[PDB]
Design a protein around this nucleic acid. Structure first.
Lengths: 60, 57, 251, 81, 50
RNA sequence: AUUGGCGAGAGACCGAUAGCGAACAAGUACAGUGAUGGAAAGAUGAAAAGAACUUUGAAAAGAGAGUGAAAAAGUACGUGAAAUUGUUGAAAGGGAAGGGCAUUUGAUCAGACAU
RNA sequence: UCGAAUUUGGGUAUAGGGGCGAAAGACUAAUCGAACCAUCUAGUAGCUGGUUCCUGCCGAAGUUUCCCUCAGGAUAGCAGA
RNA sequence: GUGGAGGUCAGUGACGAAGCCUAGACCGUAAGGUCGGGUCGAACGGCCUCUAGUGCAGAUCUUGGUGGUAGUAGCAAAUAUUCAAAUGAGAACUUUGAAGACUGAAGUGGGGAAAGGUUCCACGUCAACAGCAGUUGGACGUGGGUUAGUCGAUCCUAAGAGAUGGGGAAGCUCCGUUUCAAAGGCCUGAUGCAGGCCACCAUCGAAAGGGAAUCCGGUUAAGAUUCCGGAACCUGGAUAUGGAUUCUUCACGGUAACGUAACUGAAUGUGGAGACGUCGGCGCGAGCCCUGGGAGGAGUUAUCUUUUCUUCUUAACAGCUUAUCACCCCGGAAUUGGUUUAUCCGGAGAUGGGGUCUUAUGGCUGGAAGAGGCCAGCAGCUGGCUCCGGUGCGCUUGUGACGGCCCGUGAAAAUCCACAGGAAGGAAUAGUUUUCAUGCCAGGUCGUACUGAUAACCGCAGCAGGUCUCCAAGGUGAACAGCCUCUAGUUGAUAGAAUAAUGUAGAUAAGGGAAGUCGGCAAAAUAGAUCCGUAACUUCGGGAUAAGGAUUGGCU
RNA sequence: ACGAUCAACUUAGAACUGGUACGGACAAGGGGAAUCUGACUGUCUAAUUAAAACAUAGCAUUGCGAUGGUCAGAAAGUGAUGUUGACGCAAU
RNA sequence: UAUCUAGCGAAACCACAGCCAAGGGAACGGGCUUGGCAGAAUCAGCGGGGAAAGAAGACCCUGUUGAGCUUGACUCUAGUU
RNA sequence: AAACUUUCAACAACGGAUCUCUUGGUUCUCGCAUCGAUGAAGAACGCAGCGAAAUGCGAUACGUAAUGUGAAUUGCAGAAUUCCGUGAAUCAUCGAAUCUUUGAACGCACAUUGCGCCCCUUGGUAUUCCAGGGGGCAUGCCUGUUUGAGCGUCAUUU
C-alpha cells in the first residue's frame, strides 16, 4: 500500500514500483483518500513476497 | 498505533497535563464566545422582515 | 398597464409550436430541370400521420437524376393517393390524382391542392385537410392562370407554379364536435399553446383593454382600428361590419 | 404554505463553484458567474459596488509577481549578479 | 451526494484537513495572541456552501 | 491634476461604542441560491517567577504552602463604576415609596476657647 | 378527487414596467396593484419626536395686509440688545 | 465644567499622578471647587490666553449590560414501560439478560436519487450540546476507512445553449447555427501521395432517455457486482497453429420455408436494430405464497396433537433441447369450415398431413458441491443429509398474441449489423481470406464510507412541516383499507405523587325530539353482502345504492 | 352405453343449535319534496374568501392568399405563429 | 394537563405603582380634595378593571406627499400611415 | 418580635465604564512612474519534524541560487567547528532559477480532474495498437516567405 501523488495513474505506478523495487506487479488499484492523496494497492506477482520486500524497504 | 499523537505532542513540547489543561481553556474560551454571541444576537435576531400577523396590526 | 397576452405571444418562449413529433416539412420537389421540362416518377412508400396537422402526409421516393441517392419527399396526401402508387411530377405528367403539374398544363375546372404561390417555392395554398383550389382559367399571353382559393378569393399566378391534383384528404375533420375539453387540450397540446383562452373581459384592467369594471363588459367599441398600435388590437380588428350575417352573402 | 413546507423542496443548486473565482456564484443554467463575469473576458465589476471592487481588487491576493516589481524598479531592472 | 465530482471531493479534503483544534505548542510561543481555533467548522453548525 | 501604486516627513486630528468596516488569524467568522451584506474582538507582570509540595474531594475545585512589590494582578488576568445581586450591621414599615418646612430621638462630625 | 384538463422528479425556456397567469392583481425564493442587491442618497418634507451647564436682568404673540394662503411664509406690530 | 494648544507657577507625583468608592468635612445661591479615609498604580494640575467633534433624562434614540415578571408560563401529539446484574463517585435514561409492547411489508424493515460531508468505525473521554439526567451519543480528543476493463461518469442526441463565416451595435455585446464562406477528414500504397473517397458542418446538452462486456461464495471495527478464491464475457491490438476454402479459382445441403464451424468483397446506395403511447381481458414464465412425503434440529406434552416452528438452495456464463406468432411443401374447400374469453380467417388457397424459423422462456448437463445450509461426534478436526413432489380468478413482475381509444397515432442521434454492387486480389504448394476454434497482451482518469430523515437534507434547531423512488409474508376481508402476528427494527418523546375547578381529546345519558341557534353548526342516525322493490322527471344515456323491506353466526 | 384416478373454491338448499344473537371488534351511504345559481369533469386568491368566479366543449363575430394578418427586436443578411397556408393562424 | 415535587426554565409587558365612593378636573382618577377605611407573608382560580398587551389607526381629514388604474385632462412618445 | 420589602455602608458578586497607555486610523505635504501573451491581477489545491489560521511559497514548495552582515533560530525537539569562517539566521539585500491546476487563458471543452492531433524518443515480438518521457497545436492583425485561385488581365507559344 503506497501513498501516491494525485497526478499518477496505474501505468505510472506499475512502472515506478518495478523500477524502485525490482518486483513485478500483478495489478494496481488506486483510490483517493478523503484527506486528498492517492492510495495505491499494488499486488505483486505470486513469486515475490510483500512481507519480504516491505521490511527490505524498511517498514516491517 | 506504534506511535501516537500523544507521543508527537510530547516531543512537540506539550505533555499530557498541559494538553488537558490547555484543551479545557480552549473549550472555556469557545463557550465564552458562544455565550456572548447569543446574548448579543437575542436583541435583534427576531426581526423578521415580512411577518404576517394574522390578526393584522 | 401590463403587456397583454397577445402582445406576449410574439416573443416566443412558451408560444413556439411543439414540433417534436412532426415528420418534417411538407414540401414538393425542387423545381429541377427534369421536373420543369418533362416529368419524373416517384413511388408512394408510406402515408403517415403528422402531429398537429389534420391532413396525412405522404412520403414519395424519387430517384436522384444526378446521383444514386433516393430523394424521399414528404408530400401532403391527396384523397386517393395510396401506398404503392406512382406519382408523376412534372410538366409532361398525365393528369391523374396525386400527380404534380404546373398550372399552365391543366385544363379549366381542375381541382388542385398544395398549390405553389409562385414558381420555385414548394407549395403554399390549400394544404389544410379537405381544402382545394379550382383552376378558374388561363392566360398564355402573360403566362398566368387564375385560380379560386379555399377562402373564396380569386388569384392569378404564374402558369409554371405547381400543384398536386385532387383534394388534401382528411376532409370533414371539423364536422365532429369535440365533446370534452380534453379533446381540445390534446388538439392544442401539439399546437403552439393557444388554449385555454381567458376572456379579456374577465381579465383585470391592467391585463387587457376589456378588463375591469364592476360588470364584465367591454366598455368601449370593440371594433379596433387597423392603425391602432400593438397592445390596442384586442377584439375585432379592422372590422368592416359586425353582427350576424342574416343574408345569402354568396355561397 | 409558502414558508416552512415550501422551504423543504429546495435541494437543487442554482449556482456552483466558479472557475475564475472560487465563489459559489457560477450560474449553472446561464453558464455565467454572477460575481466575476466568467466566462466573459472582463471581470464583472461596477463602480456602484465600491465594496465589491475593494473585496477583489489587486492587493487582496498573493500578488505573486507584482510584489517584486517595486524592487526591480528601485534597482533599475538590473541584470547579472 | 455519494456520486460527487473531484472538485467537490478536493474541497472535502481541505475541510477535513482544517477540521482540527489549535496545535497546543502554538500557545507557548512568545507574544502569542491566538487563543483558540476561531475558524473551527462543524457539520451540525455551519454548512460549507459549496 | 492626483481619495490609485511605491517611498518618505508631519498634525492645536481620533484614541478601542472614537479613528478606515478592520489597532487583533478583517473584508476574517457569519447570512443570503445570487448580486451582495458583514461584525465582535487591544492591556496579568519587569520577568511566568503561570502557584513545587501537603491535605479534603471521584473530579472540577477548595484550604493551606509558595512566586511576586502587589494574587485588592491567578492565563475568567491593569484600574474595575453604574444598573443588578449575596451576607453582615443599622432603621422604618395598618392598601404605595419618595419630597419641602420645623423639631424630638439615635448615630456621626468640624471649629474654638487650650488663645 | 382518485385513470385523467391527473400527480411528480430531472433537464430546459420565459427576468421586473418584464415574465407567467383555466384570470385571484394571483405567482415570480416567507417580499408583488411592479421582486431582490448596490449606487444616485445624509433624496425632499409647510409634518411628528428630541435638542445636553448655572445664575442675573429685560421679557411677549396668536393681531393688520398679501400669498393655490388656511398645520406654512413675507410684512407691520409686541421684545431684547 | 471637558478634550486639545501657546505662556507661566524652575507646579503635584512611585515617600504614590490619574481614576473609582466614601448617609466623613469645608466653600459657592448654583453650575461646581477643595479636604480627609479606602482602592489604585504613572501620569496630572492652578492661573493668563487660544481652540472645539465641549456639558444629556428623554428622541417607540445607538451600542453594550442588567432587572421585576419568576424559580413563574411551562418541558402534556406519535399507546409503555418493569425487574435484576454489570460499569461507575454518581443510573428512570449506558450495557447485558429477563419480561411487557409497538411499527405490522403503501413499516418505526432493507437500498438509493438531490442534499449533507466524514456524521461512517475504533480507542480515550464529560468542560460545553443532547431545553431532565447521563458513565451514553450524530457531542469532545486522537486515529482508521471509500480498491472497478464489466456499476456510473466519460460517448450519443432530446427540449435547448453557443462560437466561426457573416451581419448589427458608440459599446459592454446582439442576431444567427448552416446559413450571401475559397469552411475538411477517411481509406490506403507509400507528407506530396498510386491516388481515390466523400460533401456532410465547431461544440455543449441526461450520474432516471440510447449505451460494449461480471456472477457466486468468503472476507472487515468500518469496504466491495471494486478486495480474495473460483468461474465468464466485451473492446482494442498484435497475432501462430489447427480447421474451413479452392486448378469448376472465392462451400455445400434442402422441393421450400431454410441449416451449418467457417465458407473473398472496395467506392457508393438500400434496409434493419437503437426506436418507444395508454388501458382491458387472456396465455405462458420467474420470484413469493399455500401444501404432501421424507431426511435433521428446536418448542409443547395435566390431557390431546402422524403435531407447531425451522433447513433441504443452485448465480453469471456455455452446450443440447424448448414457443405463441410467422412462414414453406402436398391438397383444393358450400352439407361452408377452423377458432379466441373477446369474431376473425380462408380459391389473394381454409380445415388437414408433414416441415422451417425467432429462443422471450423453461428442462437437462457443465459452472457445482469442492460453495452455502442443516445436523452429529471428538478436541479446530472428522463424518453425514442437502431428496421427491401438488394446486391455483392467489400477490408482484416479465413477456406474447390480441383488442379498445384519439381533430392525442404517442423522440433523436451515437453506434452496430445485413443487404444490392462487383472495384481489387487469389491458382496448385500456387495460393487468397480467417464474421470458425484455440493461443497472447492491455484496458487509463473520476465517483465508490454513511444518513437519506419524528436526529446526518431544507425549514435560525436534535423543528409533529416539506423532500423523488425500488423490494413487500401470514389471517380476517372485495381489498398494497382497518385490526392482530412472522423476518427486521425500535421501546425514542423529562419523570415521580395525587385525581380540585376550568380545559383539550374520547364517550354515555331517562322523557321529549331542533322547542337551541343566524343556520340541524357539532353530534347522532344509516352503512358490508344476498334477495325483493324502486316514483316524478329525462337530453332516453340516467335518475338508482332512488325510496322501502327481509336475511346474515356456529355446527351436521 | 360407459370406468378409474386426481384436483379448487363457488353458489343454492335442509336440518340442528343459542339469553333472537350473528356485516357481533374493525369497516361502513342518511333519505325525500323543491327553489336560486353554474351544463357537466376541471382550475385560482401558497398564508382568512374554492364560489354563482375562471376554464370548457358548443355558437357567433373579425383580420389575413405570404410583397400578408397578429406580435417581438436598439438594429440586423433578425425573429414567433411557421416543420404553418383559410377544415390554417391570429383577435374577440 | 392544570395541581404538588426533583431537574431545567423563558416571554409579553413595566413613568412610579396598585382599596373604594363622590367632587372638581382634558367634561369616566391609583395618586388631587372630602369622606369610607386600613395589619405581615401567601396559594389555586378568576376574567370587572388597569380607558391591560400586540401596531406611529387601515376608516375620515390635511399635505401645494405618492402609487396602481382609466379617459374625451395637459404635454409628449415607441410603432404605424 | 421574626420573615419579607425598602434606604445606606463594608466585603463579595454580575458587568466592563472611568483613568492611563497605542506596532492602528485619518488628514496634509514632499519625491518617484513601475502590471500583463517573456503570461499579469484574481482563484483553487497543496508545502514545515511538530500548524488549523495569518504571513511566505509552488512537487526545487514558511522555500533554492547570488550578495551583504557576521553567530544564531527558539515553544519543543533536532542540528550543532555548525563559527579565527565561502559561514548560523523565521536576518537583510536580490540581478539567477523553480513557479502545481487555473485565470486576458491560448488544442477542443469544462458542473468532466473529459476528449483530441502532430514531432522526437523508450518499452510492450510494433510507422498504424497500447503505455511512459520530452516539445507543440487559439484568434484578429502587420511585414515578409512559400504555395496557390480568378477568360480580372498582359505578353508569348500551337
Amino acid at each position: 500500500v503506497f501513498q501516491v501523488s494525485m497526478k499518477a495513474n496505474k501505468y505510472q505506478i506499475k512502472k515506478a514500483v518495478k523500477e524502485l523495487y525490482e518486483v513485478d506487479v500483478l495489478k494496481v488499484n488506486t483510490l483517493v483518500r478523503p484527506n486528498g492523496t492517492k492510495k495505491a494497492y499494488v499486488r505483486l506477482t505470486a513469486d515475490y513476497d510483500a512481507l519480504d520486500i516491505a521490511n527490505r524497504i524498511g517498514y516491517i | 498505533r506504534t506511535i501516537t499523537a500523544a507521543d508527537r505532542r510530547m516531543v512537540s513540547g506539550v505533555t499530557e497535563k498541559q494538553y488537558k489543561k490547555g484543551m479545557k481553556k480552549m473549550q472555556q474560551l469557545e463557550k465564552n464566545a458562544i455565550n456572548t454571541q447569543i446574548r448579543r444576537e437575542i436583541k435583534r435576531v427576531n426581526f423578521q422582515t415580512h411577518y404576517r400577523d394574522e390578526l393584522l396590526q | 398597464g401590463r403587456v397583454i397576452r397577445n402582445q406576449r405571444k410574439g416573443a416566443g418562449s412558451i408560444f413556439t409550436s411543439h414540433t417534436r413529433l412532426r415528420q418534417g416539412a411538407a414540401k414538393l420537389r425542387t423545381l429541377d430541370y427534369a421536373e420543369r421540362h418533362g416529368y419524373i416518377r416517384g413511388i408512394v412508400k408510406q402515408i403517415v400521420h403528422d402531429s398537429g396537422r389534420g391532413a396525412p402526409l405522404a412520403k414519395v421516393v424519387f430517384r436522384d437524376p444526378y446521383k444514386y441517392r433516393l430523394r424521399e419527399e414528404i408530400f401532403i396526401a391527396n384523397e386517393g393517393v395510396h401506398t404503392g402508387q406512382f406519382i408523376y411530377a412534372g410538366k409532361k405528367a398525365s393528369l391523374n390524382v396525386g400527380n404534380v403539374l404546373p398550372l399552365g398544363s391543366v385544363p379549366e375546372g381542375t381541382i388542385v391542392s398544395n398549390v405553389e404561390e409562385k414558381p420555385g417555392d414548394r407549395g403554399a395554398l390549400a394544404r389544410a385537410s379537405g381544402n382545394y383550389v379550382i383552376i378558374i382559367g388561363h392566360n398564355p399571353d402573360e403566362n398566368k392562370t387564375r385560380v379560386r382559393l379555399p377562402s373564396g378569393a380569386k388569384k392569378v399566378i404564374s402558369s409554371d407554379a405547381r400543384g398536386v391534383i385532387g383534394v388534401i384528404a382528411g376532409g370533414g375533420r371539423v364536422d365532429k364536435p369535440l365533446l370534452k375539453a380534453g379533446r381540445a387540450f390534446h388538439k392544442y397540446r401539439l399546437k403552439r399553446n393557444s388554449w385555454p383562452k381567458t376572456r379579456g373581459v374577465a381579465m383585470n384592467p391592467v391585463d387587457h383593454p376589456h378588463g375591469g369594471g364592476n360588470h364584465q363588459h367591454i366598455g368601449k367599441a370593440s371594433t379596433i382600428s387597423r392603425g391602432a398600435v400593438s397592445g390596442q388590437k384586442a377584439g375585432l380588428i379592422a372590422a368592416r361590419r359586425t353582427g350576424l350575417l342574416r343574408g345569402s352573402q354568396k355561397t | 404554505g409558502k414558508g416552512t413546507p415550501s422551504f423543504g423542496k429546495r435541494h437543487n443548486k442554482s449556482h456552483t463553484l466558479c472557475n475564475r473565482c472560487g465563489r459559489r456564484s457560477f450560474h449553472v443554467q446561464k453558464k455565467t458567474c454572477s460575481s466575476c463575469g466568467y466566462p466573459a473576458a472582463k471581470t464583472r465589476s461596477y463602480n456602484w459596488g465600491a465594496k465589491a471592487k475593494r473585496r477583489h481588487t489587486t492587493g487582496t491576493g498573493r500578488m505573486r509577481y507584482l510584489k517584486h516589481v517595486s524592487r526591480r524598479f528601485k534597482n533599475g531592472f538590473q541584470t547579472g549578479s | 451526494a455519494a456520486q460527487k465530482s473531484f472538485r467537490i471531493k478536493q474541497k472535502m479534503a481541505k475541510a477535513k484537513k482544517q477540521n482540527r483544534p489549535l496545535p497546543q505548542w502554538i500557545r507557548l510561543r512568545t507574544n502569542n495572541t491566538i487563543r483558540y481555533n476561531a475558524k473551527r467548522r462543524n457539520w451540525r453548525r455551519t454548512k460549507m456552501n459549496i
